Amino acid sequence: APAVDTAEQVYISSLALLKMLKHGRAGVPMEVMGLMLGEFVDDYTVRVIDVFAMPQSGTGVSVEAVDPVFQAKMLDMLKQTGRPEMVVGWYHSHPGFGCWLSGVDINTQQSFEALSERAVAVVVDPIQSVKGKVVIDAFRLINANMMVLGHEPRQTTSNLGHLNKPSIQALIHGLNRHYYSITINYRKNELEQKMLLNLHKKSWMEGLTLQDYSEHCKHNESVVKEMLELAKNYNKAVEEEDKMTPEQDPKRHLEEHVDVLMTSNIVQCLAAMLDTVVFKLI
Amino acid sequence: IKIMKSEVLRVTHELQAMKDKIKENSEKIKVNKTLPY
């Protein structure tokens, strides 16, 4: 009997992740659900090209929460649009509950896997996804007959599936007992990286735009006053150092202050000279 | 007298359709206003 390898990866595209995050935040504090479109490239790869949200239902997040008619018309209209990808799986948001599958989640995942054996149930935490870390895991299932007899849920052929460690919160809620966490990887080509770089790419202007001069003098005065106080502290510390065998430091904070003063002053001076030169009447 | 007849036809079409959208609004209202208050 074939067994899914532990090296299988869920290749979630960048815009799919963005849409999942935005929809999950939008539904807070409720739970949202949407269907994931993509293609199962092979046994060891699941590619999630795109994901579309679904209307909020009073049931919550269940298999009655996915309605047939909206799903059908959405799929047909996207196929007409240019995205003829089969539904790979479903996603729902556990707001602040961590990433795991509840009993209703497991029931919905069994319903989805009835359609196709390969079907992930990736969930996302919209509020725990604070800037930096993104809390999103993907679980498929564990067949009951598979676990009861004795075999491991997944065959292992490499260290790819063991790079990340499971969480206690997921483990208690049935991880490695009813479902396994599939390693998640983000498909991000150079084009989308460059496009997303425009979010914080300031402009061609601020590289030449001088900061306010009076504000610059006020900032310099403040930092030099801090320099004076920190220099008094450093002198006192050094005077203690001689009466000290090897046994916050003013020196370090002084170093950070001198660094910020240096960069600010040098940047302002160089920018002033450049505006003097290039921004000329001639 | 023809333009008002055309307006009557368009207004009855509008009534017939926005009956359906108001019923859909009611369905979504109940979808939030379900039961366990």
Curated annotation (Swiss-Prot), chain A:
<dbReference type="GO" id="GO:1904813">
    <property type="term" value="C:ficolin-1-rich granule lumen"/>
</dbReference>
<keyword id="KW-0378">Hydrolase</keyword>
<dbReference type="GO" id="GO:0006303">
    <property type="term" value="P:double-strand break repair via nonhomologous end joining"/>
</dbReference>
<dbReference type="GO" id="GO:0043161">
    <property type="term" value="P:proteasome-mediated ubiquitin-dependent protein catabolic process"/>
</dbReference>
<dbReference type="InterPro" id="IPR000555">
    <property type="entry name" value="JAMM/MPN+_dom"/>
</dbReference>
<dbReference type="GO" id="GO:0061133">
    <property type="term" value="F:endopeptidase activator activity"/>
</dbReference>
<feature type="binding site">
    <location>
        <position position="94"/>
    </location>
    <ligand>
        <name>Zn(2+)</name>
    </ligand>
</feature>
<feature type="modified residue" description="Phosphothreonine">
    <location>
        <position position="245"/>
    </location>
</feature>
<dbReference type="GO" id="GO:0046872">
    <property type="term" value="F:metal ion binding"/>
</dbReference>
<dbReference type="GO" id="GO:0031597">
    <property type="term" value="C:cytosolic proteasome complex"/>
</dbReference>
<feature type="modified residue" description="Phosphoserine">
    <location>
        <position position="203"/>
    </location>
</feature>
<dbReference type="InterPro" id="IPR050242">
    <property type="entry name" value="JAMM_MPN+_peptidase_M67A"/>
</dbReference>
<dbReference type="GO" id="GO:0045471">
    <property type="term" value="P:response to ethanol"/>
</dbReference>
<feature type="domain" description="MPN">
    <location>
        <begin position="10"/>
        <end position="145"/>
    </location>
</feature>
<keyword id="KW-0645">Protease</keyword>
<dbReference type="Pfam" id="PF23594">
    <property type="entry name" value="RPN11_C"/>
</dbReference>
<keyword id="KW-0862">Zinc</keyword>
<keyword id="KW-0597">Phosphoprotein</keyword>
<comment type="subunit">
    <text>Component of the 19S proteasome regulatory particle complex. The 26S proteasome consists of a 20S core particle (CP) and two 19S regulatory subunits (RP). The regulatory particle is made of a lid composed of 9 subunits including PSMD4, a base containing 6 ATPases and few additional components. Within the complex, PSMD4 interacts with subunit PSMD7 through their respective MPN domain. Interacts with TXNL1.</text>
</comment>
<dbReference type="InterPro" id="IPR056263">
    <property type="entry name" value="RPN11_C"/>
</dbReference>
<dbReference type="GO" id="GO:0016579">
    <property type="term" value="P:protein deubiquitination"/>
</dbReference>
<keyword id="KW-0479">Metal-binding</keyword>
Swiss-Prot record, chain B:
<comment type="subunit">
    <text>(Microbial infection) Interacts with HIV-1 Tat.</text>
</comment>
<comment type="similarity">
    <text>Belongs to the AAA ATPase family.</text>
</comment>
<protein>
    <recommendedName>
        <fullName>26S proteasome regulatory subunit 6A</fullName>
    </recommendedName>
</protein>
<comment type="function">
    <text>Component of the 26S proteasome, a multiprotein complex involved in the ATP-dependent degradation of ubiquitinated proteins. This complex plays a key role in the maintenance of protein homeostasis by removing misfolded or damaged proteins, which could impair cellular functions, and by removing proteins whose functions are no longer required. Therefore, the proteasome participates in numerous cellular processes, including cell cycle progression, apoptosis, or DNA damage repair.</text>
</comment>
<comment type="subunit">
    <text>Component of the 19S proteasome regulatory particle complex. The 26S proteasome consists of a 20S core particle (CP) and two 19S regulatory subunits (RP). The regulatory particle is made of a lid composed of 9 subunits, a base containing 6 ATPases including PSMC3 and few additional components. Interacts with PAAF1.</text>
</comment>
